[model samples]
Target: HLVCYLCFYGFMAQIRPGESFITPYLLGPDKNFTREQVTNEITPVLSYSYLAVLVPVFLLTDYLRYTPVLLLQGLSFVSVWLLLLLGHSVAHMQLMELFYSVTMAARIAYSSYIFSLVRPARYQRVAGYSRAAVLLGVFTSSVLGQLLVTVGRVSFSTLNYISLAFLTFSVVLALFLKRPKRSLFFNRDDVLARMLRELGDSLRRPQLRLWSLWWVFNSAGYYLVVYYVHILWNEVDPTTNSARVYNGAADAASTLLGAITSFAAGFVKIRWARWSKLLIAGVTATQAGLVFLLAHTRHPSSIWLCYAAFVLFRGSYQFLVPIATFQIASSLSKELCALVFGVNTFFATIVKTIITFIVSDVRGLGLPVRKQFQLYSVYFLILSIIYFLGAMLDG
Candidate 1:
């Protein structure tokens, strides 16, 4: 679990250094691409490509082995960084975006690999530990980025170089990751066949369908807010525009709060297993309330409020997902756990794609970008209701 956590930590720490900042970097230099164009068109195109790659990768994960996947992912990371460093113009950005999809696919594969490594009984706890580590790394990276910018010597290219260093470290770690012993249920072909069969079966189950919808809607709302938070920040303070210093400071603030809350939830899970649902409901409700408040206020004071809301939303959601996964896995046979996760991922990713499309269209409508927060608030309200209903349904 510690090893898995460390691996995830390194992966996330490097993410913002290169990947997350790419759109903004391109928009600054490329006359052809605006922020909206990059976020809506280019980014979603890349994500959809990643969704396509995920299907094949998930199917062949057990067969080709996790080690090779990590190596390939590392190579992709290196290639993308090199492209960003050397390539100029919108065309190079587009090509890099396309190849970057493989990195997302690799992330999903890595999660499955971790699940395969950790024993079933320990999955939930391991997941919590992993998330905690990721939040820690996120906090560290954000602070580091901010400090670099504050020094007034940092550039986007320099950030990419730092990310390249992290990628090199990840590749080194991947070399030490030993493959798990194959079990009777862990074979490649058999697992794929069984996974497909169960997926068909799950579609016929109304409860599973409902749970899947809940997952989709909840994830959509969360992502919509997360992806657009920077836009909101820019709206509030134009000076902060293209300022990695400010953006990283906000991220650091949110992650610090999120980490504390996440650790608290993990502690509760360890002490009182039955409180998990209540913890999820309470935190989600708080997030919804915060979103509601954020939508109505233009005061810069409200920025901190929205940031707090994000912290609550992120912390609670992260805690709930692993616990929910554990419950779902427990309801099925051991052989079905991986398959169930795959099916869930398929649905979640599809919903995310759809929501991304919707957000893109909505942003294009030019409905006063400030009012976007209201739209997101409505989305969060719906998510809170769904989570509330989920609690009742579980009861």
Candidate 2:
């Protein structure tokens, strides 16, 4: 019952059709914000606030238990869309970015929250199901948004209004999730000192350490690319009206293909410990090539094609998620597992923040979107080399 309910919650919570065209919307007459403001001024707030809120939210999610954090996500989601529809100034949009950051931080709760309810053997399938639920939700939302924009000539503001209604309904759905009695740190029997020691001890395991490192390094780069890719999309195909934008369809293809790849991940039966490094190296190299193409491509269709394939390859490697989750959690207690995952996420966000500060921030190098992608392609190439060397040494 919990699995079914949780999957439903995952699906419903992610159905924000307005999310696809957010950059265009912000640039449109409704907001009348400059492209510079949207990129450097408003968007960077998400990275900064996400770092600021994550550790505290991580502790609070465990202390208050997961349900409250999930509820906060619901409230934050509604506030985000609310601000989207009404906000005009840079400051208002920055505040909206903060609220959106809260939503992203709170997502850690959902990933760890499920472990308390299920046993070890079922972990793999459950993770796949929850992720598939989210992919399908995004896919459906994107298709609907694309059709509405292209066919019905719906305005971005109206699509955002629709998102608000759906987001509000998610809060109601979240209210129904049963709160677990036991959480990691706050509700556990161990003292603070002992729990801290346990965290150190858990990472000492070679398998767990390897996967956590992958989680830290790879996810940081992956999210950075995902965040900025849409802006790159706009640059490739400058359009006067939202009607010419097909971010909805591009996002739709990615999510739909992502779901299919995630489903395929379930059928993988290789010896993960033996082959993990090679697999990761190979996938990251593929992703590097995609980013290189993305940087070089000028046509809108070429850019979209590259971006779609980029996301699909990323999804293909998502096979590692459950494997890593189980690898990290199998030996540790539930509290420690949550701590480990949160710490991994915290570190990933830190890396992501540093990259954003250096590359995209107004005060930093502040390279344009094309240069950013060029650097990202090089970044992935470096990551691929490091792992390829690791795979060679492991043999």
Q: Model 1 clash pairs? A: none
**How close to the true structure is residue 58 of candidate 2, measured as C-alpha lDDT?**
73
Stretches > 4 Å off in candidate 2: 1-8, 111-133, 177-180, 188-201, 267-272
Q: For model 1, what is the error of residue 92's alpha carbon versus the real structure, in angstroms, after optimal superposition?
A: 3.6
Per-residue C-alpha lDDT of model 1 across residues 52-151, encoded as one tens digit per residue: 8888876556676777887888888888888888875656666676668787677766556566666778877776676566656667777777776666
Best-fitting candidate, scored by lDDT? 2
Scored by TM-score, the top model is 2
lDDT value for model 1: 0.62
lDDT of each: 0.62, 0.79
Per-prediction backbone clash count? 0, 1
- In model 2, the clashing pairs are 184-335
